[PDB]
Symmetry: C2
Subunit: 189 residues, 2 copies
């Protein structure tokens, strides 16, 4: 381990995640050039025309495909509803990390919803929503380790049982020693 | 449900996912200002300096934090090993849909690894890797429905049992008629 100047470290040119998104976007586009759009886009009225409300990839693939017209569903939605829909469709993706899940629920709450309505809108128990929100009181590095898959939701819950000022220390212990959730619970002392 | 000129539909300005990524980057940067990096960056020699091999967010947050130096581990990695590492670190994330997982595996196979070798590196059974790869023979629209959470992996497997020419039709039935995995298999 050494100390290097940031100015002498260039970004990682390998971005497989981005490459995969572009590949699949193109593959979706190629397919619709033939049969047109799969399922309806969701839009709302805006000025002279419309504004996309749901189906961004579907929408962008249609553009790549060079289509002139696409099937859609027009619905009068206020800015607030459009945002709520954006958050909800996002929370349904197989893409969701538990941290993003929590940020989504929190955003819905800030918009005036209750855990109940949130839970309903997403199809989960109120307790599931409350438990996800708790993750947001963890320090940023603990949430990053969770997203990287270096620790589990269980490790995170154990860290929440430690006093705030001991959480980083606890995180290090878990990472350095490959602790299980059970042993992370033993860290309290 | 009606048809309308694509050119009359403008982009969705609401990008909560991107907004969240930016917000969390900043809070991570704010935290690095106070605590420094929790884990060294992994880098390899490149040109007159070094090139990041793992820890992109930690790296960018450090830049945002205004740090001049950061802890790091230097290793001599060939382009191939660096890519392999990139694909493996991505496959460990709590961020993947089963389709991305499949694409990652396939990428590793294309690099010369064996299903067995892929399985060993990501900590999964060989059967898990083979099953995931099967998802890639599904048509693009079925994979999108999976990624959007409109259908489950179970539905996807059910569609694999149908002949290629019937998969799109099958997808529509599942979405349109709203049947379950059980009902799907038929
Ligand atoms: Co970190
Ligand atoms: Co867990
Ligand atoms: Co937004
Ligand atoms: Co997941
Ligand atoms: Mg209304």
């Amino acid at each position: 381990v050494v100390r290097l100047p940031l100015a002498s470290i260039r970004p990682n040119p390998r971005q497989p995640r981005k490459r995969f998104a572009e590949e699949s976007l193109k593959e979706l586009a190629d397919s619709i050039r033939e049969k047109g759009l799969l399922q309806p886009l969701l839009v709302r009225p805006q000025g002279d025309g419309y504004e996309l409300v749901a189906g961004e990839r579907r929408y962008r693939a249609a553009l790549m495909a060079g289509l002139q017209e696409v099937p859609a569903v027009v619905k009068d939605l206020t800015d607030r509803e459009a945002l709520e829909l954006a958050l909800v469709e996002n929370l349904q993706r197989e893409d969701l990390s538990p941290v993003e899940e929590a940020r989504g629920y929190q955003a819905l709450l800030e918009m005036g919803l209750t855990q109940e309505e949130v839970a309903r809108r997403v199809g989960k128990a109120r307790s599931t929503v409350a438990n996800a929100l708790r993750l947001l009181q963890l320090p940023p590095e603990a949430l990053e380790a969770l997203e990287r898959g270096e620790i589990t939701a269980g490790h995170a819950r154990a860290l929440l049982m430690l006093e705030p000022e001991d959480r980083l220390w606890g995180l290090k212990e878990i990472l350095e020693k490959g602790l299980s959730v059970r042993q992370a619970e033993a860290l309290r002392e």
